[PDB]
Amino acid sequence: YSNEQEQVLGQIVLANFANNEGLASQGDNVWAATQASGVALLGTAGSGNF
Amino acid sequence: ATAATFSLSFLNSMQQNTGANNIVATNQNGYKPGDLVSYQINNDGTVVGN
Amino acid sequence: DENRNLVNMQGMQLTGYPATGTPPTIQQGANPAPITIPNTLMAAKSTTTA
Known part of the structure; x- marks a missing residue:
């Protein structure tokens, strides 16, 4: 901003799965997670296995 | 709306030795009001409505 | 978005952790x-500590 500092407006959440091949692809470039992939493991980029 | 009375639990937590304090898992047994977007049959037969 | 929600071109809103509080x-x-990301200005807050 124009008062010499920034502020954080969010942080990009990454989400890896149990198996990557279990997600059901959808009508666009996006996928969707099903029972073959389990629930998403949320997390932040560069941390852990993300 | 009167308040949620819920057992918040820190079970299976441990004390690590390297790194920073990081929430490894979180769970909550409540949800938002929603209706229906899809219904499917899984490979063992469970009719699941997402 | 025209409401300045970060999306890809298929209208799907990118999601991230919220950023709350001042700062x-x-x-x-x-x-x-x-x-x-907003259009509003960062409102000036008083000095908590120096």
């Missing part, structure tokens, strides 16, 4: 909301 902080707590 905002990454609230790394597994509740990803739609990331929105």
